[PDB]
Design a protein around this ligand. Structure first.
Ligand code: NAG
Ligand code: CL
Lengths: 247, 29
């Protein structure tokens, strides 16, 4: 996160960090969607042109973290993974279409003040809230920044999104970020990849994950926007995996 | 599941975070 502010404790209790187990290394953000399931971007786990193809035993997650440079005893939770599931039509060759992956925890986690799942959108919530100008929130760590950072970013008009890149964009992506001369700045960056873009519903006041940080051009550069996996468009596969596996 | 998206330190205690109003203000314009 660039041009954000420190998160308050417990502000993003669905925030998950993905680590390579050996050797230790922060890879990506992710999100808690139940006691047993974590949502992330497929490119965090699989990207063949770079020979990237992590398996479950390569990885750990850390949940309930507020500070980056410390094991947070009594607050943080570390979990191993049973299985990774990548969208079968994830298009790593062209444009990262359907950049989505689920991770099944080895054991269910206990909820606390600091650990609590985010909601996934239904049709009505997606249609109401996914509109240009409407702001969501992304969380992650700062450049080179020991405390979790937060930034609020408005959803961008689709022709403006398309216009900003040579990449073929699909209905499975949206973009967010401030236009130049809006004054305000802010963006997701690199290590925030895989992390959640959340919105608070005005209908029931619950937080919904609408996006997954997917790709962009650099960091908080004028006229460029971060691109996000459209979680609702992919909910059928999410629900299928969670229903089929997860025993 | 049934209790998703409600933060124990915020919605569950009738407390606002420092910037959530800005999000909701953006929908009601
Ligand atoms: C990823 O790894 C599995 C082996 O666990 C392999 O079968 C699959 O072909 C690999 N995919 C790549 C490198 O694209
Ligand atoms: Cl799908």
């Amino acid at each position: 996160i660039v041009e954000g502010s420190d998160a308050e404790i417990g502000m993003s209790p669905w925030q998950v960090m993905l680590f390579r187990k050996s050797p230790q290394e922060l890879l990506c953000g992710a999100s808690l969607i139940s006691d047993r399931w974590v949502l992330t971007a497929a490119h965090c786990l699989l990207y063949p042109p770079w020979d990237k193809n992590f398996t479950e035993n390569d990885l750990l997650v850390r949940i309930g973290k507020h500070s980056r440079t410390r094991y947070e005893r009594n607050i943080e939770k570390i979990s191993m993974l049973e299985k990774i599931y990548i969208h079968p039509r994830y298009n790593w060759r062209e444009n990262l279409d359907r950049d989505i992956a689920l991770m099944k925890l080895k054991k269910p986690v206990a909820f606390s003040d600091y650990i609590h799942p985010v909601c996934l959108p239904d049709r009505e919530t997606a249609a109401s809230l996914l509109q240009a100008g409407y702001k969501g929130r992304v969380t992650g760590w700062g450049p080179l920044p020991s405390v979790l950072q937060v930034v609020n970013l408005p959803i961008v008009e689709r022709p403006v999104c398309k216009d900003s890149t040579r990449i073929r964009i699909t209905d499975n992506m949206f973009c967010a970020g401030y236009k130049p001369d809006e004054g305000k700045r802010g963006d997701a960056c690199e290590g925030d990849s895989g992390g959640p873009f959340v919105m608070k519903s005005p209908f029931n006041n619950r937080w919904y994950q609408m996006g997954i940080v997917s790709w962009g051009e650099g960091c908080d550069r004028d006229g460029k926007y971060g691109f996000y996996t459209h979680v609702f468009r992919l909910k059928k596969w999410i629900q299928k995996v969670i229903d089929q596996f997860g025993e | 599941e049934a209790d998703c998206g409600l933060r124990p330190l915020f919605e569950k205690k009738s407390l606002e975070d420092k910037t959530e109003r800005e999000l909701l203000e953006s929908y009601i314009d």
